[model samples]
Target chain A: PQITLWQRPLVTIKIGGQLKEALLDTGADDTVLEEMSLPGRWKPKMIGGIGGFIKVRQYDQILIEICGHKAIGTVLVGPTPVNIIGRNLLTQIGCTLNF
Target chain B: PQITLWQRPLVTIKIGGQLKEALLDTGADDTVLEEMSLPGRWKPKMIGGIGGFIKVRQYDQILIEICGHKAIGTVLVGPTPVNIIGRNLLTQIGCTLNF
Candidate 1:
């Protein structure tokens, strides 16, 4: 599917048998979920944005099905403004930007 | 042009005779630039991110040449970490997300 930028590029995703909506964010460095219960030996970490730094949990080897497209990569879980699907997993799913 | 997520999607943009690189962001609601310099009656505004809110100036009807593609719209100026090409201008350039 080709997602247009006329609106927020949101897509349905499945993680650990849970369904959720996320933004296909090209600006973000990593995929981050606001709040979730996932299986991982997670480590506490920090992320940056235009405002400031965000304290988050880094979970590795996480699998997510984006619009039914599967990918496994590192995921950051914390209180973000929204769920973001970043490049690490976007690359795994062969996502690209075009004009 | 098709830009794969294998690397950062940085594109050269011309704004006010200035050539610079910007992230063609999917999640950002509006385009924002750091170190403001434009002739307009902009008002003080605030924008939020994953971390917190950022203070900015909202300048409307600014002309920006994104990758040489023309677009005129509202552009927020602030102390952002990087120049962001948000949906406002991305849509004008006919950008889309494809798999």
Candidate 2:
């Protein structure tokens, strides 16, 4: 078996008690977890991004399952709602990005 | 006057060709720079997160300017773009989150 260098590590995360698979992208800056896909008990805050910040935005921490491992992380609350495995979690693991 | 402990940092970053103010969220996983807010010269990669993976997705690198500072970073090619400053950039600087 070859130990392939991965640019992004893909794994599953348990948010609000639900388990979901995601790409652990080291390239991502923040943990951009989607809104609807996120579990319960998450608190959010208004935030701005490249497009500008939305005042009514929110964010929170959730359980993440990666490499058959588990951890808690903060995620974003998006209006349209698309879960992203972003930087918020990657730094804790301390991995290097190839691209 | 007191130096307030911040849970997250707010800053401006340039993506594609536009400059905008965004919250430098330490709580996020990846550097989630908004897609539409991003400029040209990018490719999207289909990725999975809390929900699942979607094919026909691509991603690429872009120039980011922050706090009178600038650098290049990898970003997600989102169908709906929202600028996010995730871990991809934060770890390089070394910061912490209050919340």
TM-score of every candidate: 0.97, 0.39
lDDT of 2 by residue, B6-89 (tens): 222356666666777665543344555444544455554554333334332234556666654565667665532434566666
TM-score of chain A of each: 0.95, 0.57
Please, what is the whole-model Cα lDDT of each candidate in the order they appear?
0.91, 0.49
lDDT of 1 by residue, A1-99 (tens): 899988888899999898999999999979999887888589999999878898999999888899988898899999898999999988998898999
Q: How much is the lDDT of residue B39 in candidate 1?
A: 90
Per-candidate clashes, comma-separated:
0, 53
Clashing pairs in 1: none
Docking class of 2: incorrect
Chain B TM-scores, listed for every candidate in order, come to 0.96, 0.57
